[PDB]
Symmetry: D4
Subunit: 150 residues, 8 copies
């Protein structure tokens, strides 16, 4: 990867729906070269794919909660818990964090009931779970994980 690639990625991370011609005219290089560079970035896994950015509000994903999970030490219990947490519907992010030493889980649902039935009641029964603490999001000031190049 060279500086040309960064300029390309810095544009695609925002809008992957530009024409090659428009991107070409912006970074000043042949469309054949641009097209070539994009293809290989994909091949080398720098670009893992293209997604449609859907507004969660539009799906009534109103009940947003960030949960901290403390796991029961022993083996084993740890990684095992990470994977059980990641397969719960509505959970889009699971992180093993230092600190505190436990898991941070990002999940979205339409209502309280849904959250309770799909997330809460389910996590309550997992064996390897010592204790959890939820932090309800009342306001999203920013959420742009797509922006990796500042």
């Amino acid at each position: 990867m060279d500086e040309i690639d960064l300029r390309i990625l810095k544009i695609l991370q925002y809008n992957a729906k530009y024409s090659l011609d428009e991107i070409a005219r912006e970074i000043r290089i042949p469309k054949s070269t641009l097209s070539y560079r994009i293809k290989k970035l994909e091949k080398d896994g720098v670009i893992k794919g293209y997604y449609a950015y859907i507004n969660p509000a539009s799906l009534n994903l109103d009940y947003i909660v960030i949960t901290s999970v403390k796991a029961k030490y022993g083996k084993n219990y740890h990684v095992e818990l990470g994977n059980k947490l990641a397969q719960i519907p509505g959970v889009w992010g699971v992180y093993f964090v230092l600190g505190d030493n436990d898991f941070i889980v990002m999940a979205r649902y339409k209502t309280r009931e849904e959250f309770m039935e799909k997330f809460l009641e389910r996590v309550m029964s997992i064996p390897e779970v010592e204790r959890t603490s939820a932090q309800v999001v009342v306001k999203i000031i920013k959420e742009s994980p797509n922006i990796v190049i500042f």
Copy 2:
């Protein structure tokens, strides 16, 4: 939005690079109808855009940290802090959470030095900040914010 739209969105949230023909053959509807439905979803803001999903590791975004920020009460100091946090380079997520009552900040950097210079040292000088606590991510089990339809 009807069930047909959900089927469309459930595919686009994964791969927005399918051909209309392939999506049409999958959900069984005229390409003209599919194309029409997608265009309006965009118009109604359900689909806010299309992004290239870039692998953070490929950019050496190694120092991942989740920071909790406690703000000084008064006015005012609150929203003000949210916006100052959101404009810091490397910060992609800022949430005002209940709970705890404070802000959860998601940020990525290549190294410790970068994190310290771009995030730490900067947050340390913000007036409205009472105290912060960082939780270093040592392992990402899952990160797919693009998946809104389970």
Copy 3:
């Protein structure tokens, strides 16, 4: 329910001992209509009943305590604990709260001894209880759960 009902409920939540005539003269509607509307609110369960508001001090309910209960995760142990907590004499409120993720219990007794014997010693032996923390109320600034319409 319409605005007329709200005006009625806003009065009954305070004093259910007014005459229909007095309420009628206040909201300007036939007593037969008022009487009809009240009867159906009761039928539809909006009005669950009428209670006498008794001053707790008059019964020497001096030892007021708000207890937080952390439950042992597994199944099951959760709901089970909620119900065991709710049947303890002197306990009038039990809430499953997010946050913290555990139960908030409101209880009143005449003395410390009573509290210890009826609440403390009993909760100490419940299997599903991990740990509890009590917050003694030294002053009630306000307690009007009857007011649902502000």
Copy 4:
């Protein structure tokens, strides 16, 4: 107050809509005596009034939250804060608790927005407030403050 009064209060705390005749037949005393005893209990302030018990769900009071408030020490700042908290719409209970040494606030709203606008944003600007912590109620197992005699 004698044991006869307790039997009366133990019934009125449940249903203040019984006929004097029915209560009389239950506790075995002249209706004139019963009527007399009730009148004086009211006079001596044991019975402060009669309320209609309204189902909060019926009013869409969905966003229930228990907030802990830590106050800035000095004077003065304390009682002052108690009263400012008690006059906020939606707040039905405010307690000064030992423990922890701070205030426990019970409040109900229809939604998150309402809670934020009526409670959150307002408490954030109060001078005497050091910090707050909210515990969202996801389930009410029991709420019968009307029951003072077990």
Copy 5:
């Protein structure tokens, strides 16, 4: 007990080595009456005994520590733990406290080694103990438990 008794107790709590004549001349009553009143206070257990107040420093009781003990819930485990804590040499005070809901233990030793061997290592092996936290006293500003009448 009357006001005369309080005047007597208020003197004896300080110095039980005054002559009856000197106390008599101070509160203005016959020595026979004073002597009589003291004898009965002892009989009724108001005065449980007379002790020599020994300076702990003089015994090299240098390592003073206040320990909080969290007990494992179940039965039973509670009171049982209180008594095991009270029989440990060097422990002069054990309190079951609300709050926090656990035990506060006051203990004095000559050195760190002694504290570790007599208290620490011993408490570490008690079954009913969940966890403990010690607060080392680096300065005694006041310690006059003998003063009950202010």
Copy 6:
């Protein structure tokens, strides 16, 4: 101080009301020697005095509370706070503890009101106080500060 002194102190810490003859017969030494040794222990300040041990219950000292006080750093504010805490009526013990780094205050009162008026409301107004936390004693398992020799 020699072993003979310890034997003497070990008896006086319990009951200072024994006759010299009885103590003499117990440790096997001339009454003149015993009397001499006691006199000098007093002179050297090993024995600071003799007190009457009064049962706190007998004075209705029912509201027992152990308070932790966090002080505002600066100078100065520290020692200053220790002394202000020690002169509050009902406070018999004040300790500066490591740990936690703050003050542990032992106080007794007859009721909640007294505690609030004499202790609470007073500490709330002290400038150098950052925050406090009270732990209500619901049971005294042991309180024998008079025993310094085990």
Copy 7:
């Protein structure tokens, strides 16, 4: 040990590579005496040895972490855990601390992966471990354990 020894130790703790002649000229004593005094300090174990001070940065020891370990009470489990912690590669310091009552572990590694594999994953499986909390060092302001004489 006398003041002459302190002067010697105060120099050797800094630079053990001075010539005896240079140290002799500094403290003003015969080289034979100096040499004699050093030899015996070593014999009496005051001087346990001479080490080369290696810069950790030069070995890419970048991931520095201070971990707090809470142990499961019972016996036994305690000391046992101390020794298991001390034999983990990369761990140079293990302390049993009061306070908090648990272990403080100092460890250094080159990267996050190394830390996770050599420390984290290993501690996660130790039976006697209740829970741990890591504090990542982002800046070493000072680290001179070699300086014992100030």
Copy 8:
């Protein structure tokens, strides 16, 4: 640096008092080469110096404490505090840690008094200090910061 250097450093970190001949015979290389390699390691700053390892117990460094310091946010106040902490006599280690976000201070003294006078009372007056918490070391299981190569 090559593997030969590591073998050399791995020996010098333990005992810098071996003869070049003995080290040469161990790693199998000419003494002239060994001597050359050591000289340059020193020049490149890999080896910063040679110290005498002094037993702290031998100096009666009995009062060992690990203190956590929370600093007042603003500027500036941060680094400033780090340096003020590092110049306090008895303090050998100061670390700025993530986590928690504050400073970890390692200090040793002979007694409690010394600790209070040299460390405590001094830190209490520093302006930029919000609060501190001390963890008394009652047992050093391991302390070998000199070992950088495992």
